[PDB]
Design a protein around this ligand. Structure first.
Ligand code: HEM
Ligand code: HEM
Lengths: 726, 726
C-alpha cells in the first residue's frame, strides 16, 4: 500500500502555483520559512515517517485492521484496549465551534513597523522598524457554522494575534469600519436575529430571512453596516482583497502619558476586489471552500497576503469636534476628515501544519492589549471584554487555553495562577500567592514606565450617574448610510439596490419588507425607490417627502469608501482559465504563458476530459480540470487559444463557460479561430471593450488582457448582461 | 405594538402549502397533532406571549437595550449582572457537533404495525396492530459539519427513536443497504479519509478529494458502498424519496426463544427519486438548506413523510446458504433471494418546536435494543456498541443525556445510578445499590418472559481463539459492486460513470485515479472503460482481461436495487414553477392550478420582480419569488402559461430558467404563445417527448404534464442536453 515508485505522492518543498502539486502542511511545504513563533511550536510538532504505529501510551500495534474477537466470526472482546483507545479518541474529536465567526481560515506571518512610533505610543511592537513581530491571522465569516460556505454575503472577520515582547496583542477586527449595533447588551439579540431561525435552523450563511430584517427594521442603528453588507463589500474575491478595521476608537499612550485616540485599519496591498452576487452564490455550491483554498494556495505559491497597518489619529482635545460621537461603533471616521497614517506591513507567509490544532483552537480576544494601548468607553468594545475570555472556557475546555501551543506567548509569562483543566505548566515556585516572603515575592510587579513597564490604565475622568442609557449623541442613524451610498460608483449603487432587493424578496412577511423600504427612504430616495420598484412597493407621498439626512461634516462623498472609485488593482496571484482543444496552437500558448508569468498571474488548463492533450508541435499539455470541474466562477479571466476549435465549438460546457464569465463581467480573450465564440456571447464584429481579440495571442493581445485584469471586472458590460441566458 | 395591526405576522395553525405562510414551531403550527411523546414534553415547553422579560433567575428586566455605565457615555460597570447573565449564556450556546452525521433534519411521528409479529419476536412495539409507538426521526448526511449543505453527494443517515412501552429502541440506519467497511476498528481511518483533509480542512461535504480515493483504492471492501454513493442514490431529491436500511443482520427473538436473523428496511411511500449531479451541486449553492426546508414544509403542508418498515428474515439454519457472509456489512441480501416482508407504517407528522433542544440534542444509539431483539457478531455492529454512549459524554456534557427531554423514555425508568453532571432526577430511594434490604431490594430485576420481561441475550455458541483476524468469508469485494451495476438502468449507469469521473477528476495525484480505475476493472469492464475514457487513461491489456467476479447466488441483476427500473412515482408533495408574464391568460392559470391542486402538487408563481401582476381578466396574481430567487433547481417541473410572452421572451433569467430545467431532465409545459420558448431549448417544431405543448392549458395538457411528473425526469432527453450551453 505504498507510495508510487516515482515520488509523485509528495509535493515539492518549493513555491508552486495553484494546482501544480498537492497542498501540504506548512512545515513540510516551506521548511525554511521561520519566525520566533513558528520555531517555538517545535516542542509539539510531531512527524511520522519511519516511526512505528502505536497506541497513545506508546505500545506498538501489530494489526490495525481488526478488532479482537473470539474466533474470526465471533463477538468482539471487551479486552481490546487498542480498539477502545482508537475509537474513544475518535468519539471525542469535536469541540464547540465559535458562537460567531465559526467559519475561518488562518495563516502565520510577521509584522514590522515602517518607523518608530514612540512619539505617540510606547507599545514595544511599534518601537523599532527592525523588530519583527510574529503574527497569526484568522479570517472568517460571521453567521455560518464551521462547515458553512466561504463566498456567502456576510461581514468578514480579520483577527491578528501579535506575539510581542511585552505580551500578546490581539487586534480583533472586521472588513467594514463599523458594526451593526451600539451596545454589547444587544449582541445576542442581533446575532440571534441573523443566525438560523430557532424553530428549524434555516438559513445557513445568509441574512436573507425574516428575523434579520425584522430586527433591522426595528433598529435603525443597524442600517450603516447593513448598507456595507448589501454592497459588494459583503462578497469579497479573496481575503487578500478586502480592507480590515478595528471599528472602535482605542487609545495610544506614549512614555509621557499622552493619550491619542486611534482607529485601526488594514490596507490590502493586493487591492480591493469583490465578486458579484450571482457568482458568489453559485460559488458557495461549486466550491464552498473557495476563500480557504485561495488563501492557502496563495501562500504556497509565494503570493503572500500583505497588508498595511494604518492609524487614524485624533488628539484628545478633538474628541467632540465631529458631528458624530467618536465612541459610537456605528459611525465611521471618513478619511477625508482624518487620514490614515501608514504604520507598518504584515506579511502572511506560512500555512499551518494542522488546521484543528492551530486554526480551530486559536483564541483571540480584544481585551489582550499591551502597554502603550488602552480602551475607550465605546459601549460595544466595553461589553466585548466580558465575552472573549468567558466563551473560551467552554470552547477550549477551561482556563488554561493560553497553554494550547498556538495561543502561547513567545515572551515570558509568570504568575501565581494554578491548576485548571489540562494544566500543562508545572510550577516550581514555593509560593502561589503574593505578597509572599517564601520566594522573596517573585514573580514581582513592575512599575509602569517608558519600556518594559507594568500595565497602568490611562486615568480617564469618569463623571456620571449609574444609568442604563444610550448616549443622546448616538441617536442618529441615517447620515453615515447616506455618505456611504453617495460614495459608491453607479454600478456599486446598482449592486446595493440588488442586494437589498434579493434579500427582502426572501422575507416571507411583506410588512417587514415595507418597514425596511421606509427606513431606506430616510437614507436616500433614489435607493428607496429602486428597491421598492423591485419589490412591487409604491412609496407614499409622505415617504417621498422625507428630508434627507445631513452631510457628514460637510462631506458629499468620500471615495475611500468605494471598492473601485480609485484604481488600486494588482494582478499578481490572480488566475486565468485557458480552454484547451485537442490541437492547440503552441505559439499562442507560449505567448500567453510568458505574459502571465511576467505579471505573476497563474493559469489553469482546462478541457472536456482529464489526462493530456498534445499541442501542434508535440508538447504534451496536462489538464488541470474539466470545464465543469473548474467553472469560470473560480478564475479572474478566460483565454481561448487558437487550434482545433471545432473540437470544442459545440461543447455545451465550453460555450457555457464563456457565457458565465461574460455575465460575471470577467475579461475574455479569444485568439485566431477562437473568435468563432464571439457568437455565443452575442457580441459584434467590431468587438467590445472587455473582449480581447486578434489573429494570434501576441504581446499586444496579452497586454490588453492584463490591463483589463488590473481593472478587475468589465463594469461597462453591465447593460449587456440582462439579455444573456446564463 | 410592533406586530402589524392585521395579524399577518402569525402563520395560520392549519396545514398550508410551501411558501404560503411563514414557517413556525410545530406546537404552534399544529397544536392538535399529538402523540404520547409530544404530550410528555409539555413539562418543559415554554411559551412567551403576555409574559414579562426576565433574567434566568426570574428578575424582571426594565431596559434590555443598554448596559449599565457611569454616565451615558461612560464605562460599563462590573455590577451589571443582567448584561453578565445574557452575554454569558450567549457565550456558551454551542455544544460539539456529532463526529459524523453532524448535518441532520428531524421530526416527530408515530409507527404502528400491520399485524402482531408475536410468532417471530416478543418486542412489545410489534405485538399488536393497535399499539401506536411515538417516534422521533433524524435524517442526515455523513461527512459535513452541522452548517454544511444538504444536497451534497454522500450517504444519508436515517435514525428512528421508537419510544416503546418496554424501552427506547433506536434503529440507526443509512439510505444504502451496506456500509463502506467491515470492521469497526477501521471506522476512524475511513472517516478521516472522507472528512476534510487535516492540514487545511478542505473539502466540506465532499468525498471528491485525494485521501478518500486513496483509502478506497487500498481497501477494496469499500467499493460496494462507493458504487451506491457514485450513483444517483448519493443525491436524493428529498428525505421522503429515499430508502432506509439497518445494514447489519440483527436477531428477532420470540417468546419460545427462537432466533430469526433479520435485516431492517424502510420503503418510502412517496417513491424513490434523486437529483442529477449538476443540479444537486448547484443547489448546495442556491439553497444549502433544501432538504431541511422541504421536510419541514412537507409536514406543514400535510404531505407527511410516510415509510413502510420491512424485514428480510432468514432462519438460523440458513446462515451459511449464501455466497456471502450474512454478518458482512459490505454485502447486501438481494430481495430476489430474500423478500422484504411488510411490517408496519411510520408517519412523520409534526416538526419540532426548537431545533437545538430537540434535533441537535437528540441521541440515538444502535445498542438501544429491547427484549425481542438482539445483536449478531457483525464486527462493524459490534464496535458501534463501544462508540455511541461514549461520544454522548462529551457531546451532551455527561452521563445524564437520557434526561434531556427529547431522549427521555415515555415508559418507567428506575435504577441505582446516581449523580453525574446535569442530574435532573431527584432519587428518593434509601438505597443506591442492590441487593439491598433497606428498600426491600426495589427496584427489582425481572425474569425474561413473553411480555414485560427482563432482557436476556440469546445464548449463541461462541467458539474460537482470541484473534484480531478478518473472517475469510469476508474476503470478496467485487461481486456485489457488479450486481449493483448490472441492476441499474442505462441512464443510471451513465450517472454512475459520471460520478466516479467527476470525483476522480478532483484527485490531484494521478496515480490514485489510475489505481481506482484498476479496481473498477475488477467489477465491470464497460464501467472501467467509460470512467478511464473521461480521465484520459487507457486500460492495459492485463486490465482488459481480468475476469469478472461471479454472480451472487446465480443472479445477474436485481431490479429492486435500481431507483427507477420499476416505476414507483408519486406526484403528491412535488412542486411546479409557473413562469408569469404581465398579462397572463387567466383561463390557462385556472386550469393549471386546479389540476395541480387535485393531485396535491404545489405551485410557485414566479416573475422578474416581487408584488403582483394582473391577468387578461383583471385577476390579481401574487408573486412568490423572482426567477433568480427561486431557480428551477428547487422545482420538479416548469409550466409557462400563455399571455404577453414578449414581456419575458428577452429576459435572460426566464430563458435560463427553462434551459436549466431542460438540462436537468425536468418536464416542461408551454401553452399558447409560450411555445416561442421552444427556440431557447432547441425543440423541434413537431415537438419532443418530455415537452408538453398545446394552444392552451385545457384538455389533456395537464394530464400529460402530470404523467411526466409521475416518471420524475425525462431520461430520454439525456443525449440532447450535451450540446446545450447551460
Ligand atoms: C466591532 C465589533 C466586533 C468585532 C469587529 C468582532 C470581531 C470578531 C472576530 C473577528 C471574531 C473571530 C476571531 C477568530 O477568528 O477566532 C470574533 C469572535 C467572537 N466575538 Fe466578536 N466582534 C465584535 C463584537 C462582539 C460583541 C459585542 C461580542 C459580545 C459582547 C462578541 C463576542 C464574540 C465571541 C463570543 C466570539 C467567539 C470568540 C471565540 O470563541 O474565541 N463580539 N469577533
Ligand atoms: C452500518 C454502519 C453504520 C450506520 C448505518 C451508522 C449510522 C449512523 C447515523 C444515522 C448516525 C446519526 C444519528 C443521528 O441522527 O444523531 C450516526 C452517528 C454516529 N455514529 Fe454511526 N453508523 C454506522 C457505523 C458507525 C461506526 C462503525 C461507528 C464507530 C465505531 C459509528 C460511530 C458513530 C458516532 C460517534 C456517531 C455520532 C453519534 C452521536 O453523537 O450521538 N458509526 N451513525
Amino acid at each position: 500500500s505504498l507510495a508510487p515508485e516515482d515520488g509523485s505522492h509528495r509535493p515539492a518543498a518549493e513555491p508552486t502555483p495553484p494546482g501544480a502539486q498537492p497542498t501540504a502542511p506548512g512545515s513540510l511545504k516551506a521548511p525554511d520559512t521561520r519566525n520566533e513563533k513558528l520555531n517555538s511550536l517545535e516542542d509539539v510538532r510531531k512527524g511520522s515517517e519511519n516511526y512505528a504505529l502505536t497506541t497513545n501510551q506508546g505500545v506498538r500495534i501489530a494489526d490495525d485492521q481488526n478488532s479482537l474477537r473470539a474466533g474470526s466470526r465471533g463477538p468482539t472482546l471487551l479486552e481490546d484496549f487498542i480498539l477502545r483507545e482508537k475509537i474513544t479518541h475518535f468519539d471525542h474529536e469535536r469541540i464547540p465551534e465559535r458562537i460567531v465567526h465559526a467559519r475561518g481560515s488562518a495563516a502565520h506571518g510577521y509584522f514590522q513597523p515602517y518607523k518608530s512610533l514612540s512619539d505617540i505610543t510606547k507599545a514595544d511592537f511599534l518601537s523599532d522598524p527592525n523588530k519583527i513581530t510574529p503574527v497569526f491571522v484568522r479570517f472568517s465569516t460571521v453567521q455560518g457554522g464551521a462547515g458553512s460556505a466561504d463566498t456567502v454575503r456576510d461581514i468578514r472577520g480579520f483577527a491578528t494575534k501579535f506575539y510581542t515582547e511585552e505580551g500578546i496583542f490581539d487586534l480583533v477586527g472586521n472588513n467594514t469600519p463599523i458594526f451593526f449595533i451600539q451596545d454589547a447588551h444587544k449582541f445576542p439579540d442581533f446575532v440571534h436575529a441573523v443566525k438560523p431561525e430557532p424553530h428549524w435552523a434555516i438559513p445557513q450563511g445568509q441574512s436573507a430571512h425574516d428575523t434579520f430584517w425584522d430586527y433591522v427594521s426595528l433598529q435603525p442603528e443597524t442600517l450603516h453596516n447593513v448598507m456595507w453588507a448589501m454592497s459588494d463589500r459583503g462578497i469579497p474575491r479573496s481575503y487578500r482583497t478586502m480592507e480590515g478595521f478595528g471599528i472602535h476608537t482605542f487609545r495610544l499612550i506614549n512614555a509621557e502619558g499622552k493619550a491619542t485616540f486611534v482607529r485601526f485599519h488594514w490596507k490590502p496591498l493586493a487591492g480591493k476586489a469583490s465578486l458579484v452576487w450571482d457568482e458568489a452564490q453559485k460559488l458557495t455550491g461549486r466550491d464552498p471552500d473557495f476563500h480557504r483554498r485561495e488563501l492557502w494556495e496563495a501562500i504556497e505559491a509565494g503570493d503572500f497576503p500583505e497588508y498595511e497597518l494604518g492609524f487614524q489619529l485624533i488628539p484628545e482635545e478633538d474628541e467632540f469636534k465631529f458631528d458624530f460621537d467618536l465612541l459610537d461603533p456605528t459611525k465611521l471616521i471618513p478619511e477625508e476628515l482624518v487620514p490614515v497614517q501608514r504604520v507598518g506591513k504584515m506579511v502572511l507567509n506560512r500555512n499551518p501544519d494542522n488546521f484543528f490544532a492551530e486554526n480551530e483552537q486559536a483564541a483571540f480576544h480584544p481585551g489582550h492589549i499591551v502597554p502603550g494601548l488602552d480602551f475607550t468607553n465605546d459601549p460595544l468594545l466595553q461589553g466585548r471584554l466580558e465575552s472573549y475570555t468567558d466563551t473560551q472556557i467552554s470552547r477550549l475546555g477551561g482556563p488554561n487555553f493560553h497553554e494550547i501551543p498556538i495561543n502561547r506567548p513567545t515572551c515570558p509569562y509568570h504568575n501565581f495562577q494554578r491548576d485548571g483543566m489540562h494544566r500543562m505548566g508545572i510550577d516550581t515556585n514555593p509560593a502561589n500567592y503574593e505578597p509572599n516572603s517564601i520566594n522573596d515575592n517573585w514573580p514581582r510587579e513592575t512599575p509602569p514606565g517608558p519600556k518594559r513597564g507594568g500595565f497602568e490604565s490611562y486615568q480617564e475622568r469618569v463623571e456620571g450617574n449609574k444609568v442604563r442609557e444610550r448616549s443622546p449623541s448616538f441617536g442618529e442613524y441615517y447620515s453615515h448610510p447616506r455618505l456611504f451610498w453617495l460614495s459608491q460608483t453607479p454600478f456599486e449603487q446598482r449592486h446595493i439596490v440588488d442586494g437589498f432587493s434579493f434579500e427582502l424578496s426572501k422575507v416571507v412577511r411583506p410588512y417587514i419588507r415595507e418597514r425596511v423600504v421606509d427606513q431606506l427612504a430616510h437614507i436616500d430616495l433614489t435607493l428607496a425607490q429602486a428597491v421598492a420598484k423591485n419589490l412591487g412597493i409604491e412609496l407614499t407621498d409622505d415617504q417621498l417627502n422625507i428630508t434627507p439626512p445631513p452631510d457628514v461634516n460637510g462631506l458629499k462623498k468620500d471615495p475611500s469608501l468605494s471598492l473601485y472609485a480609485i484604481p488600486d488593482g494588482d494582478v499578481k496571484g490572480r488566475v486565468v482559465a485557458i480552454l484547451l482543444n485537442d490541437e492547440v496552437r503552441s505559439a499562442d500558448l507560449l505567448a500567453i504563458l510568458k505574459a502571465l508569468k511576467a505579471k505573476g498571474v497563474h493559469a489553469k488548463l482546462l478541457y472536456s476530459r482529464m489526462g493530456e492533450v498534445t499541442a501542434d508541435d508535440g508538447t504534451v499539455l496536462p489538464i488541470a480540470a474539466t470545464f465543469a470541474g473548474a467553472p469560470s466562477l473560480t478564475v479572474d479571466a478566460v483565454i481561448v487559444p487558437c487550434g482545433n476549435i471545432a473540437d470544442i465549438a459545440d461543447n455545451g460546457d465550453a460555450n457555457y463557460y464563456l457565457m458565465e464569465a461574460y455575465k460575471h463581467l470577467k475579461p475574455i480573450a479569444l485568439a485566431g479561430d477562437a473568435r468563432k465564440f464571439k457568437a455565443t456571447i452575442k457580441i459584434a464584429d467590431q468587438g467590445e471593450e472587455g473582449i480581447v481579440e486578434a489573429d494570434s495571442a501576441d504581446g499586444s493581445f496579452m497586454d490588453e488582457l492584463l490591463t483589463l485584469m488590473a481593472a478587475h471586472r468589465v463594469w461597462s458590460r453591465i447593460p449587456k448582461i440582462d439579455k444573456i441566458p446564463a
